[PDB]
């Protein structure tokens, strides 16, 4: 009863102001980090949403002398937790000057997908990621049901889950999305899980496979902890 | 308060997407299994539902070299746990090629009920199933009341419950559903109980009797853990 | 949070069906029993409700060779727990053939009240019932407040309660109702208490008195565990 | 979750009936106690409510041979707990025959305030009541906030609270009300606190000084556990 | 369930009365204190709100012989813990006669910001305060989420928060506001945190560096536990 009467205030009636949560990829390459900011009005097109920046030296992606790391918005989705107009934004990391940071891995994938052949093919990607739940075939079904509902609420194109033979570990399927967004969504969806898991007190382990589905218009008419952009771009170049 | 604010989000306002839960009889013949999937729009006609697949070797119905088992949609009911428009779909198991799996037991019952004599008789079937609740005449009445409410919410034609002399064990009845659907409903209703029981932390035992009552147009003018299709077809052939 | 999200579903929106809880007096003469049934549509007139049956041998009111006992619907009230259209029904016990069961004590009271002199007098009855609460002037006050509100919700003509000198015990006063219905209501209201007490985990003791108030048209212009029909009929035809 | 789903039923939709809580000063002079009754329709004028009574022998204000104590409704305010239309009534004690009971202390104050000079002056009274909370400047702020909101809900003209230097003990100011009503309100306000405190499981101690503020039309143009009527009437006679 | 059904009553429907909470800086200079009062109608312009006063001897800002300390309304904001129309008011401390109290630090800041040069420059201030949570980059995120939501609800122009490297300590950045109001808001916002922390049972420590951002119209076209009015006025005089 205590402290939960808050966190649900319909701030829209009182203030037109909104919050945006900046999500980016941690320096280690297997960690994800995020922190908040306030915007005067809701923003749905990532072009309108202004850039921002942070201190990267503490994140292990730049030395202390030059720690500032820039961030440009890439994906805009609705926030599942702060159920108002509040939005989550998926943004990538850039070192000062405009060049992509070595841990970005997004700039190359985007420039590959920008090629006319790839966009003409319009590839569809579905990555089959399996995870496990640990204490701090078809335990805690509430966690997975909440995750599924939240992912469909945000805008993640997730197509289905299942139980599996190993005790307590599951798998969820992300549906075919238009181009690199597919890979994007994976990371974003992954983020949501931890927060929901943080509500319960469980530990989510993604440690190892990740089956990749590929399709193109020319025909229709991997590790779990691996960056989807790496496999999504690599399979496109190969095919 | 935690994690229960989720699982109730009215996803209908945000997305037109729906969840569909695929439920089918397990390989052992007494086990019942399911896993989830996502559909673009709700569909209440079982014809329009696409088929789907799964792995049967892990479920004890395939040796392993040929593990894939097919699924055809048979029954559509509303989901009580996810509410909204979410639907449970009852499906039967078929080995590749279209032949029924040995543990199916539905194809023969359906072909018997498809006989013109049986459909002309229009049989009405009422099953008398009793169960017991264990730790993990007229204890935990909340469980049975919740089960009754959920069953009437879904569409199960359940006609009533009662207490009995043995401590804590009850019995519920399925009314006059049209033909083989009656048998269908039994299995489906059984499923719901476990999930509701899964909410509480009890174990449901159906171990042994299930009285079977039959009626047709001609006259009007069994074990608890036994397949309703077997009894509903055997008595139909006898009469 | 768990399992209480159910038991409150507005089943009226989904299905037009209703539950009815058939209520009768136990074989011991002071125990009260009931079990559920389903009706296609809500009905507020006790005449329309069909009769029903049960097993009396397990209830100690008939030997095993001839155990079936009949039930006729007598009183219709709204259900306090199943807050929809669901209705409780108070019914009396009859041995097969149409004769009243020895533990009925109701047919004779009804036939006495059917006398033209009695209906001309239009007697008003208020029975003063005292009870006590045990662990399993003016402790568990929420229990008695809930009882008061639920009884007012159902249709029971109750009027006022209080605490008294002995610790923890209360008493509730039933308003003057039209004839035998008064006695009826007592029993029905009695039932509600146990269910509400069943929600909490208390023991309700009715062991001893029961003050009876009598009034007729002529003038205006007992133990707690005693059947109200006995005192209501005995105090009548005597004044 | 259990037993609290009740006690909030909107009984107004079902029944036009209402509950009414008859409140009177205990025999010892330092106790305020009450018991319930039912009324056919809500009434906001204290004249219309019926005369009533109770048994006073156990209350220590009348011997056993002549125990009945007579009660007339005086003040009507809305109930904070049984929300909706339910009303608390503040009533005084009368020895049978029309004479005020020795512990009443209201008849003399009312007859003093009925004097033309006092009503012409139209005195305003502000009583400074302080209390302490015990285990069973500016601890359990929820209790005092609830008391504040409930008092403003009912109609008690309370003007404010604050903390104080002594650990955990507060004080509240009752605003200037029209004549003797001021004193009236103080008593009822006290009552509400215990009930709210009864929700929590605390002990409210009023043991000692209630500062009294006096004002009239002529100029504008005491123990905490002492009866407000005594000080309110005494200061009026002195001034 | 208990006592939380209260504290949320929509007092607006019943009574037009409102509560107003008077907040003033404590005598020690590092403590902030408050107490409640009642108003006939809601007040949004601080001019309309009448002055008030309190006892300062217990607050350590005046000796016992002359303890009374006056208060004038300065800032009006909406209340998060009482919702509806209820308001908080931030007021400054003055010794009797109209001169500012030595611990005020507000009159001098106001007279400096009232200078024509400063108001012409229209300075924008953003103070960056960090805090730590103790038992009684980017633990208990519910507390900080609730604080952020409450601050945006009240009217505090806070710009965003973040996690940091040291375990459990955060920082919140308040956006630019029109002149001295900026500093004002800081204090007010700080207050809210403790109350929310009071809901949970944590200890908020502000012990240190409050980064100060300064801007004016001329160019556009500090300890954490230090008074914002001191720094916001000192930097204005310097620049």
Q: Which two tokens stand for residue E230?
A: 């001191």
The encoded tokens of residue E207 equal 């012990």
3 state SS of B15: coil
E34 has a chain D CB within 8 A of its CB: yes
Residues B170 and B144 sit within 8 Å (Cβ to Cβ): yes
- Dist. CA E43–CA D129, nearest whole Å: 27
Nearest to C27 by CA among E65, B138, A106, A221: B138
SS3 labels along D46-88: CCCCCCEEEECHHHCCCCCCCCEEEEEEEEEEECCCCCCCCEE
CA angle B53, B55, B59 (to 5 degrees): 125
CB–CB of B175/B152 below 8 Å? no
Length of chain D: 239
**Residue E211 CA, distance from chain mean position:** 18
Determine whether the interchain pair A36/E148 forms a contact, defined as Cβ–Cβ distance below 8 Å. Answer: yes
Count of other CB atoms within 10 angstroms of residue C48: 11
Q: What angle do CA E45, E47, E48 make, to 5 degrees?
A: 75
Cβ–Cβ contact B11 with A under 8 A: yes
Residues 6+ apart with CB under 8 A from A154: A77, A78, A79, A80, A88, A188, A189, A192
Alpha-carbon separation of residue C205 from A61, C60, D165 (angstroms):
73, 22, 49
CA distance B30 to A144: 26
From the CA of E232, how many Å to the nearest CA of chain D?
28
* Nearest-angstrom CA–CA distance, A154 and E130: 31
Other C-beta atoms closer than 10 Å to the C-beta of E16 total 12
- Alpha carbon distances (Å) from E19 to D137, D175, E41, E199: 20, 13, 9, 20
The DSSP output letter for B16 is S
- Spell out which residues of chain B touch residue C79, defining contact as CB-CB under 8 Å: none
Quote the minimal CA–CA distance from B37 to chain C in Å: 24
The tokens for E95 are 């010794």
Give the integer Cα–Cα distance in Å for B214 and D84: 52
CA distance C213 to E226: 77
Cα R_g (chain A), whole angstroms: 19
Q: DSSP label at A57?
A: G
Is residue B99 within 8 Å of residue B108, measured between CB atoms? no
Cα–Cα distance for residue pair E142/E150, rounded to 1 Å: 12
The CA distance from B79 to B71, in Å, is: 19
D59 lies within 8 A of chain C by CB: yes
Q: Give the strand pairing for B202-205 and B124-135.
A: antiparallel
For residue E161, list chain A residues with Cβ-Cβ distance below 8 A.
35-36
Kindly list the partner chains of chain D, i.e. chains with 3 or more CB atom pairs below 8 Å: C, E
Two structure tokens written together for C158: 């109750």
Both tokens of residue D219? 């100029």
The C-alpha angle with vertex A111 and arms to A109 and A116, in degrees rounded to 5, equals: 115
Strand blocks (E) in chain A: 18-25, 32-39, 52-55, 68-78, 87-94, 124-135, 158-163, 170-174, 177-178, 202-205, 210-215
Residue E174 CB partners (closer than 8 Å, separation 6+): E126, E127, E129, E156, E157, E158, E159, E182, E185, E186, E189
DSSP lists the bridge partners of residue A70 as A53, A94
Say whether D12 sits in a helix, a strand or coil. Answer: helix
Nearest chain B residue to A151, by CA: B11
- In total, the C-beta contacts within 8 angstroms joining chain A to chain E are 69
Q: Are A186 and A127 in contact (CB under 8 A)?
A: yes
Largest Cα span, chain B: 58
Chain B nearest CA to C20, separation (Å): 9
What are the chain B neighbours of C2 within 8 Å (beta carbons)?
4, 199-200
Contact (CB<8Å) B148/C36: yes
- Phi, psi (deg, nearest 5) at residue B156: -60, 130
SS3 (DSSP) at E202: strand
Q: How far is CA A142 from the centre of its chain?
A: 22
Q: Which helix (H) or strand (E) holds D38?
A: strand D32-39
> N- to C-terminal Cα distance for chain C?
56
Residues A176 and A182 sit within 8 Å (Cβ to Cβ): yes
For residue B222, give the DSSP letter: -
Cα A103 to Cα A29: distance, rounded to the nearest angstrom:
6
Closest approach of chain B CAs to the CA of C38, in angstroms?
Answer: 5
For E217, phi and psi rounded to 5 degrees?
A: -75, -20
Give the Cβ contact number of residue D158 at 10 Å: 23
3-state secondary structure at position B66:
coil
Q: Is C35 on the interface with B (CB under 8 A)?
A: yes
Cα C90 to its chain centre, rounded Å, is 6
Q: D104: which residues sit within 8 A by CB, 6+ positions away? A: D25, D92, D93, D94
In chain E the beta strands, taken as DSSP E runs, fall at 18-25, 32-39, 52-55, 68-78, 87-94, 124-135, 158-163, 170-174, 202-205, 211-215
Nearest CA distance, C60 vs chain D (angstrom): 33
Is residue C61 within 8 angstroms of chain B, CB to CB? no
Are B160 and C14 in contact (CB < 8 Å)?
no
CB atoms within 10 A of CB B186: 23
Tell how strand E158-163 and strand E170-174 pair up: antiparallel
CB pairs under 8 A between D and E: 71
DSSP E5-22: SSS---HHHH-S-EEEEE
The DSSP-derived string for D81-134 is: SS-SS-EEEEEEEEETTTEEPTTT--HHHHHHHTSHHHHHH--EEEEEEEEEEE
SS3 assignment for chain C = CCCCCCCCCCHHHHCCCEEEEEEEECCCCCCEEEEEEEECCCCCCCCCCCCEEEECHHHCCCCCCCCEEEEEEEEEEECCCCCCCCEEEEEEEECCCCCECCCCCCHHHHHHHCCHHHHHHCCEEEEEEEEEEECCCCCCHHHHHHHHHHHHHHCCCEEEEEECCCCCCEEEEECCEECCHHHHHHHHHHHHHHHHHHHHCCEEECCCCEEEEEECHHHHCCCCCCCHHHHHHHCCCCC
Distance in angstroms (rounded) separating the CA atoms of residues A90 and A155: 13
- Put residue D155 in one of left, alpha, beta given phi > 0 → left and psi -120 to 50 → alpha: left
Measured between CA atoms, the residue of chain C closest to residue B139 is C198
Of E27, E197, E206, nearest to E127 (Cα)? Answer: E206
CA distances from C126 to C219, C226, D16, D101 (A): 16, 14, 21, 30
In eight-state DSSP terms, residue E44 is: -
List the chains bordering chain C where 3 or more Cβ pairs fall under 8 Å. B, D
Quick one: CA torsion of E34, E35, E36, E41, rounded to 10 degrees?
Answer: -40
**CA–CA distances in Å: residue A135 to residues A189, A198, E9:** 22, 12, 41
C147: left (phi over 0), alpha (psi -120 to 50) or beta: alpha
Under a CB-based contact definition with an 8 Å cutoff, are residues B56 and B102 in contact?
no
* Residue B38, both tokens: 């996502």
Asked whether D72 and D101 are in contact (CB, 8 A), the reply is: no
DSSP-based three-state secondary structure for B132: strand
DSSP 8-class letter at A41: S
Q: What is the CA radius of gyration of chain C?
A: 19
Rounded to whole angstroms, the maximal C-alpha distance in chain C is 58
Closest CA to C95 of C70, C60, C112: C70
**D24 CB-side CA count, 13 A:** 31
Neighbours of chain B (3+ CB pairs under 8 A): A, C
Contacts 24+ apart (CB under 8 A), A116-123: A118/A179, A118/A236, A119/A179, A120/A217, A121/A216, A121/A217, A121/A218, A122/A178, A122/A179, A122/A216, A122/A217, A123/A179, A123/A214, A123/A215, A123/A216, A123/A236
Experiment used for this model:
cryo-EM
CA C86 to chain centre: 16
H or E element: which one contains D18? Answer: strand D18-25
Instruction: List phi, psi (to 5°) of E233.
Output: -85, -35
> What tokens appear for C61 in the block?
């009111």
Mutate to test the interface with E, among D149, D157, D161, D175 (most CBs of E within 10 A): D149
* Separation CA D178–CA D175 (nearest Å): 10
Q: Which residues of A touch B69 (CB under 8 A)?
A: none
Other CB atoms within 10 A of residue C44 CB: 11
Residue A208: DSSP 8-state? -
Question: Which chain D residue's Cα is nearest to C77?
Answer: D14
Buried b (16+ CB within 10 A) or exposed e, E154-179: bbbbbbbbbbbeeeeebbbbbbbbeb
Contacts of A153 in chain B (CB under 8 A): 9, 11, 14-15
Cα distances (Å, whole numbers) of residue C37 to B128, B145, B146, B161, C53: 14, 12, 15, 7, 11
Residue of A nearest to B3 (CA): A199
User: Does the distance separating the beta carbons of E162 and A59 come in below 8 Å?
Assistant: no
d(CA C235, CA A72) in angstroms, rounded, equals: 89
Q: How far is it, in rounded angstroms, from Cα C169 to Cα E48?
A: 55
Residue C136 Cα, gap to closest chain D Cα (Å): 17
DSSP label of B59? G
- Phi and psi at D99, nearest 5°, equal -95, 145
Q: What is d(CA D15, CA D38) in angstroms, rounded to the nearest whole number?
A: 12
| B9 close to C (CB below 8 A) | no
The structure tokens 């005369």 sit at D51
> Which tokens sit at D103?
């512990």
Q: After which residues is chain E broken (C to N over 2.5 A)?
A: 136, 138, 208, 221
Spatial separation of the C-alpha atoms in residues B101 and B93, rounded to whole Å: 6
How far, in Å, CA of D223 to CA of D129, rounded? Answer: 9
Residue D22 three-state SS: strand
Do residues A73 and A44 lie in contact, with contact meaning Cβ atoms separated by under 8 Å? no
Cα A172 from chain centroid (whole Å): 14
| A168 dihedral zone (left: phi>0; alpha: psi -120 to 50; beta) | left
Backbone angles phi, psi at B133, to 5 degrees: -115, 130
Q: Given the DSSP bridges, would you call strands B87-94 and B124-135 parallel, antiparallel or unpaired? A: unpaired
D window 76-115, beta carbon within 8 A of E = 78, 80, 83
Based on the number of CB atoms within 10 Å of its own CB, is E83 exposed (0-12), middle (13-18) or buried (19 or more)? middle
Q: Are C195 and C34 in contact (CB under 8 A)?
A: no
């Amino acid at each position: 009863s205590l402290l939960s009467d808050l966190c649900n205030l319909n701030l829209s009636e009182s203030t037109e102001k909104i919050i945006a949560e900046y999500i980016w990829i941690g320096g280690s390459g297997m960690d994800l980090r995020s922190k908040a900011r306030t915007l005067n009005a809701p923003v749905s097109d990532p072009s309108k949403l202004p850039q921002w920046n942070y201190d990267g030296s503490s994140t292990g992606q730049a030395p202390g002398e030059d720690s500032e790391v820039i961030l440009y918005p890439q994906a805009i989705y609705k926030d599942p937790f702060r159920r108002g107009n509040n939005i989550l934004v998926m943004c990538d990391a850039y070192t000062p000057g405009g060049e992509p940071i070595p841990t970005n891995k997004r700039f190359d994938a985007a420039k590959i997908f920008s090629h006319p052949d790839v966009v003409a093919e319009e590839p569809w990607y579905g990555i089959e990621q399996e995870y496990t739940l640990l204490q701090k075939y078809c335990f805690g079904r509430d966690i997975v049901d909440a995750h599924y509902k939240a992912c469909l609420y945000a805008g993640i194109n997730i197509s289905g889950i299942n139980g599996e033979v190993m005790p307590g570990q599951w798998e969820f399927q992300v549906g075919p999305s238009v181009g690199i967004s597919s890979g994007d969504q994976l990371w974003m969806a992954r983020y949501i899980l931890e927060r929901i898991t943080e509500i319960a007190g469980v530990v989510v382990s993604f440690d190892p496979g990740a089956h990749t589905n590929y399709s193109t218009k020319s025909m229709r008419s991997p590790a779990s902890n691996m960056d989807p952009y790496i496999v999504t771009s690599m399979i496109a170049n190969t095919t």
